[PDB]
Design a protein around this ligand. Structure first.
Ligand SMILES: Nc1nc2c(ncn2[C@@H]2O[C@H](COP(=O)(O)OP(=O)(O)CP(=O)(O)O)[C@@H](O)[C@H]2O)c(=O)[nH]1
Ligand SMILES: CCCCCCCCCCCC(=O)O
Ligand SMILES: [Mg+2]
Length: 253
């Protein structure tokens, strides 16, 4: 009866600080999580990882990105053993929390990445937490990278996703709600009986937009203050009981 949260986001989005704050927030509710760290390159792991990749695999590399890639590969093979371990502890802990490496491509597009994700998907309800670097979200490369990576995950993983606009302590108040409002009011503008929107193309886009948006939820949080983490867990819990109905179809073993 345990559920899994997998933290993904570009370098600097604050995913390790986010996971620390999630841990601490969950500890506060007297429900500590099982923690898994899949970044080989990190110095510390906030509280302690119950399963940590690096004391399982040390390099002994034979560049700096392939060196991260390969580590994942090695890990992804003992995956069934890992799942056995977490399954044995599935009624002791309420949540399992997974940190991923900053080099995001190495996990989202890779096949050993997709295996780890699916192996978890097929054994527990699991939600993707997609951490976004909000105070620079509007920078064009960051926006494009985030749209492209996020949609790729939704597509290839076919898992529920919470978009986490992180670091709201230095961003526009009510950021997450105003983001959804502009996105939804955008979908609507798209659907109008005016010239420029009637085409089969614009109709295909509108559909594609709705299919992506409907899988995900949006929250803003500050990992520093713990502001927003209640709401985050609400979303997680929301996506969890829904998991039986919608997502279990796409994950067996
Ligand atoms: N203002 C503010 N800053 C934050 C917050 N969370 C993280 N940061 C800052 O963002 C920077 C990156 O934090 P870190 O958690 O290491 O990001 P990361 O994405 O895990 C780095 P890597 O991808 O290499 O693992 C740090 O300087 C950290 O202090 C937040 O909630 N508010
Ligand atoms: C293709 C439309 C649906 C995709 C919505 C989720 C993508 C979230 C990307 C975050 C963008 C941001 O930085 O403002
Ligand atoms: Mg990190």
């Amino acid at each position: 009866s345990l559920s899994t949260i997998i933290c993904i986001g570009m370098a600097g989005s604050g995913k390790t600080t986010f996971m620390q704050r999630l841990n601490s927030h969950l500890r506060a509710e007297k429900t500590p999580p099982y923690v898994i760290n899949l970044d080989p390159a990190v110095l510390r792991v906030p509280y302690g990882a119950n399963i940590d990749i690096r004391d399982s695999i040390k390099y002994k590399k034979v560049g700096p990105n392939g060196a991260i890639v390969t580590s994942l590969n090695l890990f992804s093979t003992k995956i069934d053993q890992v799942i056995r371990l977490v399954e044995q502890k599935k009624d002791k802990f309420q949540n399992c929390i997974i940190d991923t490496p900053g080099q995001i491509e190495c996990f989202v597009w890779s096949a050993s990445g997709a295996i780890i994700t699916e192996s978890f998907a097929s054994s527990f309800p699991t939600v993707i937490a997609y951490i976004v670097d909000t105070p620079r979200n509007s920078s064009p490369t960051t926006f494009m990278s985030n749209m492209l990576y996020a949609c790729s995950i939704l597509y290839k993983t076919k898992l529920p996703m919470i978009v986490v606009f992180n670091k709201t302590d230095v961003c526009k108040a009510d950021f997450a709600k105003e983001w959804m409002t502009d996105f939804e009011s955008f979908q609507a503008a798209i659907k109008e009986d005016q010239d420029g929107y009637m085409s089969s193309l614009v109709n295909s886009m509108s559909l594609m937009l709705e299919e992506f948006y409907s899988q995900l939820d949006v929250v803003g949080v500050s990992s520093f203050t713990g502001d927003g983490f209640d709401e985050f867990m609400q979303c997680v819990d929301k996506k969890v009981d829904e998991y039986d109905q919608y997502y279990k179809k796409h994950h067996h073993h």
